[PDB]
Design a protein around this ligand. Structure first.
Ligand SMILES: [Mg+2]
Ligand SMILES: [Mg+2]
Ligand SMILES: [Mg+2]
Ligand SMILES: [Mg+2]
Ligand SMILES: [Mg+2]
Ligand SMILES: [Mg+2]
Ligand SMILES: [Mg+2]
Ligand SMILES: [Mg+2]
Ligand SMILES: [Mg+2]
Ligand SMILES: [Mg+2]
Ligand SMILES: [Mg+2]
Ligand SMILES: [Mg+2]
Ligand SMILES: [Mg+2]
Ligand SMILES: [Mg+2]
Ligand SMILES: [Mg+2]
Ligand SMILES: [Mg+2]
Ligand SMILES: [Mg+2]
Ligand SMILES: [Mg+2]
Ligand SMILES: [Mg+2]
Ligand SMILES: [Mg+2]
Ligand SMILES: [Mg+2]
Ligand SMILES: [Mg+2]
Ligand SMILES: [Mg+2]
Ligand SMILES: [Mg+2]
Ligand SMILES: [Mg+2]
Ligand SMILES: [Mg+2]
Ligand SMILES: [Mg+2]
Ligand SMILES: [Mg+2]
Ligand SMILES: [Mg+2]
Ligand SMILES: [Mg+2]
Ligand SMILES: [Mg+2]
Ligand SMILES: [Mg+2]
Ligand SMILES: [Mg+2]
Lengths: 157, 46, 394, 122, 227
RNA sequence: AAUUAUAUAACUUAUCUAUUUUAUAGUAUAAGUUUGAAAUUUCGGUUGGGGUGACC
RNA sequence: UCUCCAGGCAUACGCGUAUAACAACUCGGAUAACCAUUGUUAGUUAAUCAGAAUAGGCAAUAAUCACACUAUAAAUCACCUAUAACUUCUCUGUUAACCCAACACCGGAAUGCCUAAAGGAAAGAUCCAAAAAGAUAAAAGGAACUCGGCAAACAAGAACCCCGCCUGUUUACCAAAAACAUCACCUCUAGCAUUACAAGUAUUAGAGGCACUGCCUGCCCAGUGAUCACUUGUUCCUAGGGACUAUGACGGCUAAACGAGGGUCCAACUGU
RNA sequence: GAGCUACCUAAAAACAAUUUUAUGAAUCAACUCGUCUAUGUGGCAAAAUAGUGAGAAGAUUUUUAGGUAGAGGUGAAAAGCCU
């Protein structure tokens, strides 16, 4: 979103101009996910995928900023979690096929715990943490019982 | 004729036009409430 | 082909599912825990909710095919509001009956005898008409919702004053808003009648037969008229969830099992809500036929045969000013075929009690042209209304 | 010219506008505009028999008040449940599973008077 | 806020209550001027796909009975209720249509042209060239959108290689497939053009509001001198 | 009037998807060309006032 | 008790204690008496007045005293088929001389019934001056007044010219008209669907112009032979050769009618 | 900000008597309007009062709720209205 000078001379009027990307919708197949997605994609991304020698390579290689998409980041977490867990759900009943994919992308393997917190926003991460730490209050009855038993046991000791 | 009597009171008309639910309908109306809360007004709306 | 219902008025399609769901192996993070909507989290998917117990206030019925009484065969039900496109002709085909114009001579001759004439008959009828239309309500112009029942009720309470001459009239009593139904088949089509019949008058003894056996047999020559391309089921309610019931109008053990007459009232104020003459008589036949058929089934069982003792039922239909009189004799219960012994029906149509009523004087240039009273009052109509009543006793 | 500062109540507005003064509902409105009261929704005051009651509204000045000690959960536990466990511990007839024997309630569901969420009024 | 009254999903002969828009859009702004007011009118749903078989009925030519020819306030022409089988529908009425007459709806396409009485729908291929037709449709199974105004008629100019040329009332010639079905004859109320409104208040009844009171070429640079 | 003018409409080359050996199709776009719905800004000086002449 | 005036009682919207008694005599009522004011205490009582379960199927036939009678602008849940439940009285409105107009404002304010049986008081005491405002009466004359018969009149009758065809609409608070709309007539645009137009389709929809109506009336209408050939015209191929060519942008005006229009004239009438 | 006002949608209400006839016709109240003169002019009134006038079954008036918002809305066009 910017301005241009009519006839490309600064002595002419200043005119509003917006430059738009020639969006295209295509179908892409992810080996790690074994699913085909339909996505709005620019010709630039197609070249980047080709230079990355595969759609799956493109998602894993590209950092969070360069990717510039929340949908892409979710794919990054899904692929990373798939490789991290070595999930048998990938190409079931064909272990040979599954091993090939995992080995081909072995370089990007990272610990399972770290993979979970990939691409999440602050609110989504906050929600994830709150759920993990949610616990119903412990009845005081039990708490006092534990203290009483320990004191009695120690005294008998 | 004789002016000065434009106000023809109707509670249904009044509450629909400048009421609480009407103000909250739009963000532009919610920002009317938000400023009024900042000033300290007794009544934020009708 | 034009599809009815503009899309803008139809409920919009649900928003597309969040893309996080599409990715396999990823557990979406939603606002389920928060217990409230937030725009920046994925939309939760909830399982269907079951209360665990039944609340009558919020009971919801099952779909049609899941109903216990659902049947693939279609059942055509005729009710009050149903209007036959072909009028009488369609009604004749459904009930397998032949039409005779005019009331039976036996009924007509009953009132020709001056002994049956009531004292001050002409004057009392005029009072009833005047009472019906003007004097009964505080208002100026009573509506048809209050003077078509009044006129019919008043006349019946006048004809029923002849108990003094004939003590035999004490063996009858009436009812209101009774329920009559029957189930019968015509040329592979299942037909039912479900409709109340206002007030029913019932007697302790059956009505004398109107037509002789030879006349009943002679009906075989007559052939039911057909009305191609209109189907017999036009304007009938096609029902796929139904039960087979046949109620006379009362229960078993009623002291007066014999139905004398059925009265039909059109109390709708607006003309579109009021049946036309032709449709009214067609309604009378099916409703009158049903009551006769149900009792035939009750007495002689569910078998189909030509009845040894024909059943006779009478009906009176009116809108408060125009009266239609009906006498029906049921000769057979084997209606499945269109050829055979046929029922006989006698119809007296378009009997005007009075042409018009003025409740306020018509004044032109300070001259009272028309008085406040019934115009062109016809006493003959009441006599026919008296003949049907007296029939079966005198 | 409408008064914005006065409270909005049912006395004001047209006939159609109505609202309660805070009275608790005691019935249901069925179809055809018929009200059907429910006996259970009508509160019933449980009033004790005061015959032989030795307590009156006022207290004698001579009587000396005691030290205020707001009751605490620990204090109640020591009085009620601790002695049973202490004696049972010496006898050895104590296990974690049977805390209900001393009065523990695993869940409030099934109780007529639920402690939380409270299903009974004052 | 503005929900069009045209929300009824299922066809029914019963008249449906209408709401007029006064010309206003769904936003409340006027998109067409001169529209506002008039008598309250009830919509009578019209079926223009003449050959529509009844539920669970074979797709073969069938006939129907013309019950009545009513006056429709929502159209120039007068509709006629037609009853056949176990259903009732409203259709546009031809000039000479009378109550009690039987009309023929025939999808069957005949190699040889057969003379057709007024009001019987037949495929354009069946109709001999030159027959007056109405309720013509662009594509088969699309309902009628042409020559459905009072007194209008269309001419079947030429049938060649399964294509039919129809001279529309405006004299525009439109080609459609011979499979298209159009009923014969001109539409009713032929004398619609001959009516005289007479009084301004009459147009105000119809919903036509008064008009407003508000009361070229560029010469080339060489031609500026001569003007 | 001067300067612009992805309101609209249009077409041209490209991008791009179908297709046939070059080909005619279209086009979440860009670069042009053509109209202008509009936006922005302006009202030199001297001639006892004015239109016409003029003059600086 | 007397004299006189002639929109009153409810309802809705609205207002929110201005209702009622007692007590005060600071403030409010534009002055007093008395309170509408101040303080305290009270108040408006409803099962009838008023306000606030589910799934299917299917409706051609106005109103007007609805009969006759016609017309055109085409016009208000029920009833069925099944499922579910089987005996109830809570909640809220209710007062007043009241509302919109800074005011106890000669203004504004919808419906029902009635027109005095209901509701009210034009004058604080005085006084008879001028000027000013309003009402009534007039000798003789009768528009001689005046920009104009403005206003008034014991009159309220008659004809004319101009302009617009008519009913209608407009600058709220200086112009109500000759201006705008208007039927009829004319021109331009569009061959079509699921939110205006329009659930419509060229006798239709949009846009704009103009009083219509019989009558005079524009031009335009290849030339000559005579449905026929040449000369033209238009195109190509090179001055030749082919090819082809079978009354509508204008007036008078109807002509009558109608006008709180702009001008006139007679008659009556009158303090002009 | 459309409780005034321009326009529209929906749900509603009012119209006596007389003569024509069968109606944007006639006489004339309620009711709507606002031609003329007079008074008023810090007025009762930031547009009223007293008379006199126009329409009064219709393109009629009125009530209730809703919609159209300033680069705009509405307009039987007065550059009229939109507190
Ligand atoms: Mg700048
Ligand atoms: Mg104000
Ligand atoms: Mg108002
Ligand atoms: Mg004009
Ligand atoms: Mg500037
Ligand atoms: Mg008081
Ligand atoms: Mg006192
Ligand atoms: Mg004062
Ligand atoms: Mg007080
Ligand atoms: Mg009640
Ligand atoms: Mg009261
Ligand atoms: Mg006084
Ligand atoms: Mg005095
Ligand atoms: Mg005088
Ligand atoms: Mg004098
Ligand atoms: Mg003069
Ligand atoms: Mg005068
Ligand atoms: Mg005029
Ligand atoms: Mg006028
Ligand atoms: Mg003005
Ligand atoms: Mg005017
Ligand atoms: Mg004026
Ligand atoms: Mg005038
Ligand atoms: Mg004279
Ligand atoms: Mg409003
Ligand atoms: Mg207007
Ligand atoms: Mg009248
Ligand atoms: Mg006005
Ligand atoms: Mg008049
Ligand atoms: Mg007049
Ligand atoms: Mg009139
Ligand atoms: Mg102008
Ligand atoms: Mg203002």
């Amino acid at each position: 979103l910017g301005y241009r000078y009519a006839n490309n001379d600064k002595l002419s009027k200043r005119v509003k101009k917006v430059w738009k990307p020639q969006l295209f919708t295509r179908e892409l197949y992810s080996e790690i996910l074994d699913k085909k997605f339909t996505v709005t994609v620019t010709m630039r991304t197609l070249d980047l995928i080709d230079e990355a020698y595969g759609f799956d390579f493109y998602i894993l290689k590209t950092p969070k900023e360069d990717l510039g998409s929340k949908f892409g980041m979710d794919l990054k977490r899904g692929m990373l979690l798939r490789l991290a867990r070595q999930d048998p759900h990938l190409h079931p009943e064909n272990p040979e096929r599954r091993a090939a994919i995992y080995d081909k992308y072995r370089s990007f393997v990272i610990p399972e715990a770290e993979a979970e917190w990939v691409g999440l926003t602050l609110e989504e991460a906050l929600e994830k943490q709150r759920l993990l730490e949610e616990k119903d209050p412990v009845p005081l009855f039990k708490v006092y019982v534990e203290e009483l038993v320990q004191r009695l046991q120690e005294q008998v000791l | 004729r004789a002016r000065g009597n434009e106000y023809q009171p109707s509670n249904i008309k009044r509450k629909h036009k400048h009421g609480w639910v009407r103000r909250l309908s739009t963000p532009a109306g919610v920002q009317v409430i938000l400023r009024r809360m900042l000033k300290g007004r007794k009544s934020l709306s009708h | 082909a034009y599809e009815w219902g503009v899309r803008s008025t139809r409920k919009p399609e649900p928003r597309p599912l969040d893309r996080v769901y599409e990715i396999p192996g990823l557990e979406p993070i939603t606002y389920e825990g928060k217990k409230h909507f937030v725009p920046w989290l994925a939309r939760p998917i909830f399982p269907p909710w079951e209360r665990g117990w039944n609340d009558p206030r919020f009971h919801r019925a099952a779909p049609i095919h899941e109903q216990t009484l659902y049947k693939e065969e279609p059942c055509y039900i005729f009710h009050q509001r149903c209007r036959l496109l072909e009028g009488m002709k369609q009604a004749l085909w459904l009930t397998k009956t032949k039409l005779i114009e005019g009331l039976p001579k036996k009924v007509l001759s009953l009132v020709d005898d001056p002994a049956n004439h009531i004292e001050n008959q002409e004057q009392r009828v005029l009072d009833i008409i005047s009472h019906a239309r003007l004097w009964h309500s505080t208002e100026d112009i009573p509506k048809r919702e209050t003077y078509c029942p009044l006129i019919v009720d008043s006349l019946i309470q006048l004809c029923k004053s002849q108990i003094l001459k004939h003590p035999s009239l004490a063996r009858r009593t009436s009812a209101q808003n009774c329920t009559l139904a029957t189930t019968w088949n015509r040329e592979s089509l299942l037909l039912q009648v479900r409709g109340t019949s206002s007030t029913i008058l019932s007697a302790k003894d059956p009505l004398p037969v109107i037509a002789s056996r030879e006349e009943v047999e002679a009906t075989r020559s007559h052939v039911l008229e057909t009305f191609y391309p209109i189907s017999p089921t036009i304007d009938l309610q096609e029902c796929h969830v139904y039960e087979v019931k046949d109620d006379t109008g009362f229960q078993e053990g009623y002291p007066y099992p014999h139905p004398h007459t059925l009265y039909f009232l059109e109390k709708a104020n607006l003309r579109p809500q009021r049946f036309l003459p032709e449709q009214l008589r067609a309604k009378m036949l099916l409703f009158a036929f049903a009551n006769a058929l149900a009792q035939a089934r009750l007495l002689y069982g569910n078998t189909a045969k030509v009845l040894e003792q024909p059943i006779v039922v009478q009906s009176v239909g009116t809108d408060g000013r125009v009266f239609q009189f009906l006498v029906l004799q049921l000769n057979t219960t084997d209606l499945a075929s269109s050829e055979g012994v046929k029922n006989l029906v006698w119809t007296d149509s378009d009997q005007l009690l009075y042409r018009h009523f003025w409740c306020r004087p018509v004044i032109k240039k300070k001259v009272v042209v028309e008085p406040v009273g019934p115009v062109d009052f016809q006493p003959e109509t009441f006599r026919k209304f008296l003949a049907l009543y007296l029939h079966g006793v005198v | 010219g409408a008064d914005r500062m006065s409270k909005w109540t049912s006395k004001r507005g047209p006939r159609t506008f109505t609202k309660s003064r805070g009275a608790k509902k005691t019935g249901i409105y069925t179809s055809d505009r018929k009200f059907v009261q429910i006996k259970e929704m009508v509160p019933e005051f449980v009033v004790p028999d005061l015959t032989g009651f030795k307590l009156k509204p006022y207290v004698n000045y001579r009587a000396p008040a005691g030290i205020d000690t707001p009751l605490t959960a620990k204090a109640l536990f020591q009085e009620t449940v601790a002695p049973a466990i202490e004696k049972d511990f010496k006898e050895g007839t104590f296990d974690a599973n049977n805390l209900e024997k001393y009065g523990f309630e695993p869940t409030q569901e099934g109780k007529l008077f639920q402690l939380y969420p409270k299903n009974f009024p004052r | 806020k503005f929900v069009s009254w045209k929300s009824r999903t299922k066809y029914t002969v019963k008249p449906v209550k209408m709401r007029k828009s006064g010309g206003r859009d769904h936003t409340g702004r006027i998109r067409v001027h001169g529209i506002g007011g008039g008598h309250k009118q009830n919509y009578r749903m019209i079926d223009f796909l003449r050959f529509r078989p009844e539920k669970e009925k074979a797709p073969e030519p069938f006939e129907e009975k013309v019950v009545v020819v009513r006056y429709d306030p929502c159209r120039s022409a007068d509709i006629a209720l037609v009853a056949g089988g176990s259903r009732k529908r409203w259709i546009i009425a031809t000039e000479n249509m009378k109550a009690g007459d039987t009309i023929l709806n025939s999808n069957h396409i005949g190699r040889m042209a057969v003379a057709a009485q007024e009001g019987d729908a037949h495929p354009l291929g069946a109709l001999p060239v030159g027959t007056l037709i109405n309720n013509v449709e662009s594509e088969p199974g699309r309902g009628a959108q042409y020559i459905r105004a009072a007194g209008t008629c269309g001419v079947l100019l030429r049938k060649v290689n399964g294509t039919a040329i129809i001279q529309l009332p405006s004299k525009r010639q439109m080609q459609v497939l011979e499979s298209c079905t159009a009923t014969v004859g001109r539409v009713s109320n032929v004398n619609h053009n001959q009516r005289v409104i007479g009084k301004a208040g009459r147009n105000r009844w119809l919903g036509k509001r008064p008009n407003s009171g508000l009361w070229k070429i560029r010469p080339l640079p060489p031609m500026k001198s001569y003007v």
